[PDB]
Amino acid sequence: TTALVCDNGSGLVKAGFAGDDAPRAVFPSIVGRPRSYVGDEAQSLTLKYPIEHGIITNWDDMEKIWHHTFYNELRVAPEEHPTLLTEAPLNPKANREKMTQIMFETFNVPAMYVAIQAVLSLYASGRTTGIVLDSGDGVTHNVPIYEGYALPHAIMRLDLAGRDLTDYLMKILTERGYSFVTTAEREIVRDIKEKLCYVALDFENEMATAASSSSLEKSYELPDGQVITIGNERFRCPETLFQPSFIGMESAGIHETTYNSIMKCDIDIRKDLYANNVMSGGTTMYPGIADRMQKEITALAPSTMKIKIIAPPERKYSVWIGGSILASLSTFQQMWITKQEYDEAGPSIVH
Amino acid sequence: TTALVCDNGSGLVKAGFAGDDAPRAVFPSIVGRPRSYVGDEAQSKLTLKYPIEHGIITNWDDMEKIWHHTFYNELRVAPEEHPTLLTEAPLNPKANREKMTQIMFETFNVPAMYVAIQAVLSLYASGRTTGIVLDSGDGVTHNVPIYEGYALPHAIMRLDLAGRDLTDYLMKILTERGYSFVTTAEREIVRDIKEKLCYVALDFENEMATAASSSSLEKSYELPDGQVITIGNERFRCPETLFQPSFIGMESAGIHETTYNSIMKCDIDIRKDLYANNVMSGGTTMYPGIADRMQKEITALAPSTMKIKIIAPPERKYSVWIGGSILASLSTFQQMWITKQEYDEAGPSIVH
Amino acid sequence: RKNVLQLKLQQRRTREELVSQGIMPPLK
Amino acid sequence: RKNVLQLKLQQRRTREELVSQGIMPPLK
Ligand SMILES: Nc1ncnc2c1ncn2[C@@H]1O[C@H](COP(=O)(O)OP(=O)(O)OP(=O)(O)O)[C@@H](O)[C@H]1O
Ligand SMILES: Nc1ncnc2c1ncn2[C@@H]1O[C@H](COP(=O)(O)OP(=O)(O)OP(=O)(O)O)[C@@H](O)[C@H]1O
Ligand SMILES: C/C1=C/C(=O)O[C@@H]2C[C@@H](CC[C@H](C)/C=C\CC1)O[C@@](O)([C@@H]1CSC(=O)N1)C2
Ligand SMILES: C/C1=C/C(=O)O[C@@H]2C[C@@H](CC[C@H](C)/C=C\CC1)O[C@@](O)([C@@H]1CSC(=O)N1)C2
Ligand SMILES: [Ca+2]
Ligand SMILES: [Ca+2]
């Protein structure tokens, strides 16, 4: 009867037991029907993603992901463990309610809790005050947190993330004559992204180094043993997070939304936010991204202001780890919504 | 099953079942020792002890006795079996509600419990969520402003004088006519004279001149004996003390002025509402003319524009209990219960 | 009965809404 | 351990305390 921690990503589900240092299970958030299998069963034609931009969008299929999570991955009975699930910042009320109803009525959990992904990242780093940039496969967010509360009026949403960056990598790879096009091939590209991409410190200088030197070039070996070479594609692709126009979007880039987000906060707490920039999510893993953030918010912030970027090596997992820490805590045990409270109050209680 | 509602007064315990129009049991909150019996049992008749003083529980050992008597003799229920709503005085200390909470779950194992402020419940009883309540019992008097259902703790005023002091005072003044009321026993006769014969004067100093020059204010009273005794101005001198606590040597402002002070402590935007919803509650608001005397007094203090309304229900010695009975009946309220399970997980703090 | 009360209790504003409005002091 | 995190969480202000400082919007 240990608490379970489930982080519902657009791309990866992360699940395990509270107290543990790492998630027991990390599998694709996918349901495959042929011509239903969940997660790993599924990748082994016709995959649905139940979570879109951090929001649960297909409930029937979310129900199957949860079921696989408990019964296949974690090997537990859900009526036997308090379960903590995460959500996206600015998750609609009806959503949190449906999530809550499902847990209680379909899975009969004894108790559950819903936490904001980015808050847990912050916790993971041993902080209660800071601003998290959380950037996954489906959405990017800035969430300022003060003394452990998220400040929902100051939350900024950039709707581009890991998935869009792969897609953009597929398109630019065609300049050198490589064609990546299908679902399968997009997975090869996601791999190229994760091994070879990086954030330039100074984009236009990096473009000019690329143009006059072959020094930025890197080879990659495909599944069929063919070798390709990329150059400026390595940093054009994640430059998109600083310049969403690259992929036709009107959005401010992540340096700018970090600043806007701080600027929506009471002026007397900005010092603490600028000194506690936590990066989390798989899409903050690029080499150079920390450096580029630092340079970029230092150009926006007051000139006396101390800027620090925090970027844990394990930040693809911060969220789950924050949940594992949180749900571990003695003082936290009272915070669980129990079945008994649920029978009294209906899904509302989650508020 | 069905929730229990217990109102712990310094003077009377009001107890019963949520859903009922009236408390099932109403007994003095006293414990009598050797020289052990609770309540009515103790009334006959040898050291009487009051475990609640000025609305605050002060002898815990004896309060346990009152609670036990409440469940097992008066209500005839098993406490393990019903959620229980208890009331407390405004500004009750934190440690105190923690101790009341722990006793409930630990000595009595209630499945669930709740602690409401007396005055809030009075307000609810009148159908309001906004209002300033004057609650004057046996042990203490309070003004409690409430807005949209929340008491406003910074603006609560406390007068440590109430029904008991007023009886004691009546015993004192009854001696000017040659009557001696002295003992515990005799003081109960005086309490009765108080409830039957006292009234608040609209204009005190004129009531006195009328009493002086005419015998039209005189009333008489049959004792046990039954000797007949007559009283006059003592009828209104006695409760006048609520407007003039110096009568009994106190420095405090009278109930009219604490009401005013309490309203002035609140945001200026809600005051009109307060002035338009003055709820009187408690045995000691029962005196005839008391409503009228407040209206006159609050009107002399408020903006000349201002609508003042005094609300004084006839059931107001029981408003508190009735407020708890309504509150705890509510479907929506059912989630408000602190449950045993919640308790094992947080201990007594849960109660805030 | 005071079915009347129940209607007024759902219409009530949040403690927080009132702290913000300058009506309620917060509570430490 | 984030014994660090449990210390920080104990020593944190109330939601209401922050609404009244102007730091939080109130939950409506
Ligand atoms: N080393 C890396 N460099 C760049 N990108 C990476 C790296 N590792 C993982 N990613 C990307 O991170 C994304 C998955 O990260 P994450 O699990 O944090 O997303 P998620 O939690 O499922 O999504 P979301 O929070 O958007 O709903 C994928 O796009 C993956 O390609
Ligand atoms: N008709 C009446 N006129 C004047 N006083 C009365 C009347 N009826 C009762 N009282 C007085 O009210 C007191 C009991 O009132 P109440 O039950 O409201 O007090 P309580 O709830 O026990 O005390 P507290 O709230 O002070 O702890 C006794 O002093 C009683 O004499
Ligand atoms: C290794 C791995 C990484 C991942 O992030 O996977 C998640 C989930 C996955 C689902 C389809 C894929 C074929 C299945 C499993 C890959 C899981 O899609 C992603 O790869 C998608 C497609 S490209 C991209 O960057 N996001 C993200
Ligand atoms: C009828 C009645 C009224 C009451 O208010 O009783 C309560 C509780 C009571 C306990 C002592 C008394 C001997 C017992 C019972 C009388 C109960 O004390 C009071 O009478 C005291 C003493 S004088 C006074 O006004 N308050 C108040
Ligand atoms: Ca995520
Ligand atoms: Ca009382």
Give the CATH number of the domain where residue B193 resides: 3.90.640.10
Interface of B with A (CB under 8 A): 334-335, 337, 339, 341-342, 345-346, 350
The closest ligand to the CA of B198 turns out to be 2
User: What single DSSP character describes residue A69?
Assistant: I
Identify the CA nearest to B324 among candidates B19, B2, B9, B12.
B19
Query: Per the structure block, which two tokens stand in for A281?
Result: 């999510």
A93 close contact with D: CB closer than 8 A: no
Residue B228 buriedness (CB in 10 A; 0-12 / 13-18 / 19+):
exposed
Residue C13 buriedness (CB in 10 A; 0-12 / 13-18 / 19+):
middle
Indicate the residue of C9, C18, C24 with minimum beta-carbon distance to B129: C9
Residues A152 and A278 in one domain: yes
Instruction: Tell me the residue range of the domain where A1 lies.
Output: 1-116+315-351
Ligand 2 contact via B11 beta carbon (within 6 Å)? yes
Identify the CA nearest to A312 among candidates A261, A276, A259.
A276
User: Where do we find the tokens 């009994």?
Assistant: B248
Identify the CA nearest to A233 among candidates A215, A214, A216.
A216
Residue D7 CA: distances (Å) to CA of A61, A242, B69, D1, D12: 40, 36, 44, 11, 9
CA of A7 to the centre of ligand 5 (A): 7
Residues A227 and A135 in one domain: no
Neighbour tally for B100: CB within 10 Å = 21
B267 close contact with C: CB closer than 8 A: yes
- Element holding C18 (H helix, E strand): helix C15-20
Indicate the residue of D19, D25, D27 with minimum beta-carbon distance to C26: D19
CA atoms of A264 and A270, how far apart (whole Å): 9
CA atoms of B251 and B244, how far apart (whole Å): 9
Cβ-contact A128, A138 below 8 angstroms: no
The bridge status of strand B228-231 relative to strand B219-222 is antiparallel
CA atoms of A169 and A237, how far apart (whole Å): 6
How many angstroms separate the CA of residue A147 from the nearest CA in chain D?
Answer: 6
Which of ligand 3's atoms lies nearest the C-alpha of A42?
Answer: 14
CA atoms of A343 and A336, how far apart (whole Å): 14
Cβ-contact A265, A154 below 8 angstroms: yes
Name the E strands within chain A: 4-8, 12-17, 25-28, 31-32, 37-38, 47-48, 51-52, 55-56, 83-87, 111-116, 130-135, 140-146, 149-150, 156-158, 218-221, 227-230, 277-280, 309-310, 337-338
CA of A189 to the centre of ligand 1 (A): 13
Cβ-contact A283, A318 below 8 angstroms: no
Cβ-contact A191, A185 below 8 angstroms: no
CA atoms of B137 and B165, how far apart (whole Å): 10
Neighbour tally for B75: CB within 10 Å = 20
The closest ligand to the CA of A9 turns out to be 1
Angular region, B289: left φ>0, alpha ψ -120 to 50, beta rest: left
Ligand 3 contact via A50 beta carbon (within 6 Å)? no
Provide the residue type at B181 as one letter.
F
A21 close contact with D: CB closer than 8 A: no
CA atoms of A319 and A116, how far apart (whole Å): 9
DSSP letter for each residue of A229-242: EESTHHHHHHHTTT
Query: Per the structure block, which two tokens stand in for B246?
Result: 């110096």
Indicate the residue of D13, D14, D28 with minimum beta-carbon distance to C14: D28
The sign of the torsion formed by the CA atoms of B330, B333, B339, B341 equals positive
The sign of the torsion formed by the CA atoms of C16, B263, B304, B200 equals positive
Residues A298 and A276 in one domain: yes
A91-110 burial, b for 16+ CB within 10 Å, e for fewer?
beeebbbbbbebbbeebebb
Chains in contact with chain D (at least 3 beta-carbon pairs closer than 8 A): A, C
Query: Per the structure block, which two tokens stand in for C18?
Result: 């009132």
The percent helix, strand, coil of chain D (3-state, each to 5) is 55, 0, 45
User: Where do we find the tokens 């070798």?
Assistant: A227
Query: Does an interface of 3+ CB pairs under 8 Å exist between C and A?
Result: no
Neighbour tally for A336: CB within 10 Å = 20
Edge-to-edge strand list for the sheet holding B4-8? B25-28, B12-17, B4-8, B84-88, B112-117, B338-339
A121-154 burial, b for 16+ CB within 10 Å, e for fewer?
bbbbbebbbbbbbbbbbbbbbbbbbbbbbbbeeb
Residues B168 and B99 in one domain: no
Decide: helix, strand or coil at residue A144.
Answer: strand
CA atoms of B41 and A325, how far apart (whole Å): 56
Residue B162 CA: distances (Å) to CA of A206, B140, B166, B286, B297: 84, 5, 6, 12, 19
CA atoms of B12 and B137, how far apart (whole Å): 9
Cβ-contact A74, A4 below 8 angstroms: yes
- Cα-Cα-Cα-Cα torsion A282, A287, A291, A292, nearest 10 degrees, comes to -80
Determine the length of chain B.
352
Domain count, chain C: 1
Residues A6 and A76 in one domain: yes
The interface residues of chain B toward chain C in range 277-336, judged by CB-CB distance below 8 A, are: 326-327, 330-332
Decide: helix, strand or coil at residue A222.
Answer: coil
Paired with B85 in beta bridges are B5, B114
Decide: helix, strand or coil at residue A46.
Answer: coil
3-state secondary structure chain B: CCCEEEEECCCEEEEEECCCCCCCEEEECCEEECCCEECHHHHCCCEEECCEECCEECCHHHHHHHHHHHHHHHCCCCHHHCCEEEEECCCCCHHHHHHHHHHHHHCCCCCEEEEEEHHHHHHHHCCCCCEEEEEECCCCEEEEEEECCEECHHHCEEECCCHHHHHHHHHHHHHHHCCCCCCHHHHHHHHHHHHHHCCCCCCHHHHHHHHHHCCCCCEEEECCCCCEEEECCHHHHHHHCCCCHHHHCCCCCCHHHHHHHHHHCCCHHHHHHHHCCEEEECHHHCCCCHHHHHHHHHHHHCCCCCCCCEECCCCCCCHHHHHHHHHHHCCHHHHCCEEHHHHHCCHHHHHC
What are the chain C neighbours of B267 within 8 Å (beta carbons)?
21-23
Query: Per the structure block, which two tokens stand in for A220?
Result: 């990659």
Residue B59 CA: distances (Å) to CA of B64, B225, B334: 9, 36, 31
Query: Per the structure block, which two tokens stand in for A125?
Result: 């780093």
The residue nearest atom 2 of ligand 4, judged by CA position, is B28
CA A336 to centroid of chain Cα atoms = 24
Provide the residue type at A81 as one letter.
H
Cβ-contact A307, A301 below 8 angstroms: yes
Q: For chain B, give the residues followed by a break (C–N over 2.5 Å).
A: 35, 45
- Element holding A273 (H helix, E strand): helix A270-274
What are the chain A neighbours of B342 within 8 Å (beta carbons)?
334, 338
Query: Per the structure block, which two tokens stand in for B269?
Result: 């935007």
CA of B232 to the centre of ligand 4 (A): 24
Give the CATH number of the domain where residue A307 resides: 3.30.420.40
Cβ-contact B328, B12 below 8 angstroms: no
Does B334 sit within 8 Å of A349, measured CB to CB?
no
Interface test with A, best of D9, D16, D17, D19 (most A CBs within 10 A): D9
Decide: helix, strand or coil at residue A143.
Answer: strand
Domain count, chain B: 3
CA A76 to centroid of chain Cα atoms = 25
Cβ-contact A64, A36 below 8 angstroms: yes
CA of B43 to the centre of ligand 4 (A): 9
Decide: helix, strand or coil at residue A274.
Answer: helix
The percent helix, strand, coil of chain A (3-state, each to 5) is 45, 20, 35
Determine the length of chain A.
351
Residues B166 and B184 in one domain: yes
CA D23 to centroid of chain Cα atoms = 10
Query: Per the structure block, which two tokens stand in for B102?
Result: 């722990």
Cβ-contact B90, B119 below 8 angstroms: yes
CA of A202 to the centre of ligand 6 (A): 74
The interface residues of chain D toward chain A in range 3-22, judged by CB-CB distance below 8 A, are: 4-6, 8-10, 12-13, 15, 18, 21-22
How many angstroms separate the CA of residue D13 from the nearest CA in chain C?
Answer: 7
How many angstroms separate the CA of residue A55 from the nearest CA in chain B?
Answer: 29
CA atoms of A195 and A288, how far apart (whole Å): 13
Decide: helix, strand or coil at residue A17.
Answer: strand
| Number of continuous H segments (helices) and E segments (strands) in chain C | 2, 0
Ligand 2 contact via B162 beta carbon (within 6 Å)? yes
Query: For a substitution probing ligand 4, which of B188, B198, B238, B286 has the most ligand atoms within 8 Å of its CB?
Result: B188
Paired with B115 in beta bridges are B86
Q: For chain D, give the residues followed by a break (C–N over 2.5 Å).
A: none
CA of B28 to the centre of ligand 4 (A): 6
Give the CB-side neighbour count of residue B145, counting CA atoms within 13 A.
27
Residue B90 buriedness (CB in 10 A; 0-12 / 13-18 / 19+):
buried
CA B7 to centroid of chain Cα atoms = 9
Cβ-contact B154, B123 below 8 angstroms: no
The vertex-A288 CA angle with A285 and A293, nearest 5°, equals 90
- Considering only alpha carbons, which residue of chain C is nearest residue D27? C16
CA atoms of A143 and A156, how far apart (whole Å): 7
Residues B129 and B108 in one domain: no
The interface residues of chain C toward chain D in range 1-28, judged by CB-CB distance below 8 A, are: 13-20, 24-28
Cβ-contact B327, B116 below 8 angstroms: yes
**Is the previous residue joined to B340 through a cis bond, with omega within 30 degrees of 0?**
no
The vertex-B241 CA angle with B303 and B292, nearest 5°, equals 45
CA atoms of B40 and A28, how far apart (whole Å): 71
Residues B180 and B157 in one domain: no
User: Where do we find the tokens 């609305």?
Assistant: B55
CA atoms of A1 and A336, how far apart (whole Å): 14
Query: Does an interface of 3+ CB pairs under 8 Å exist between B and C?
Result: yes
Neighbour tally for C11: CB within 10 Å = 10
Cβ-contact A7, A13 below 8 angstroms: yes
Distance spanning both ends of chain D, measured CA to CA = 36
The bridge status of strand A51-52 relative to strand A55-56 is antiparallel
Does B341 sit within 8 Å of A334, measured CB to CB?
no
φ/ψ (deg, to 5) at A213 = -135, 150
User: What single DSSP character describes residue A53?
Assistant: T
Decide: helix, strand or coil at residue A83.
Answer: strand
Query: Per the structure block, which two tokens stand in for C21?
Result: 């409005």
How many angstroms separate the CA of residue A336 from the nearest CA in chain B?
Answer: 10
Ligand 2 contact via B191 beta carbon (within 6 Å)? yes
Q: Which residues contact B5 (CB under 8 A, 6 or more apart)?
A: B15, B16, B17, B18, B23, B84, B85, B321, B324, B325, B328
Q: What is the largest CA-CA distance in chain D?
A: 36
Provide the residue type at D8 as one letter.
K
Residues A221 and A90 in one domain: no
DSSP letter for each residue of A161-212: -HHHHHHHHHHHHGGGT----SHHHHHHHHHHHHHH----SSHHHHHHHHHH
Residues in the 5 Å CB sphere of ion ligand 6: B 9, 137
CA atoms of A312 and A322, how far apart (whole Å): 12
Distance spanning both ends of chain A, measured CA to CA = 25
Instruction: Tell me the residue range of the domain where D9 lies.
Output: 1-28
- Considering only alpha carbons, which residue of chain D is nearest residue C17? D26
Neighbour tally for B77: CB within 10 Å = 17
The residue nearest atom 11 of ligand 2, judged by CA position, is B283
| Number of continuous H segments (helices) and E segments (strands) in chain D | 2, 0
Cβ-contact A132, A148 below 8 angstroms: no
Ligand 2 contact via B234 beta carbon (within 6 Å)? no
Residue B24 CA: distances (Å) to CA of A213, A303, B48: 94, 72, 23
Indicate the residue of C13, C16, C28 with minimum beta-carbon distance to D19: C16
Distance spanning both ends of chain C, measured CA to CA = 37
Indicate the residue of A126, A152, A269 with minimum beta-carbon distance to D4: A126
The residue nearest atom 4 of ligand 1, judged by CA position, is A194
Residues B288 and B335 in one domain: no
Which of ligand 3's atoms lies nearest the C-alpha of A28?
Answer: 8
Residues B180 and B146 in one domain: no
CA atoms of A195 and B99, how far apart (whole Å): 61
φ/ψ (deg, to 5) at A27 = -140, 155
Query: Per the structure block, which two tokens stand in for B225?
Result: 């004996």
Residues A256 and A306 in one domain: yes
Q: Which residues contact B134 (CB under 8 A, 6 or more apart)?
A: B141, B142, B143, B255, B259, B278, B279, B280, B281, B282, B285, B294
CA B243 to centroid of chain Cα atoms = 17
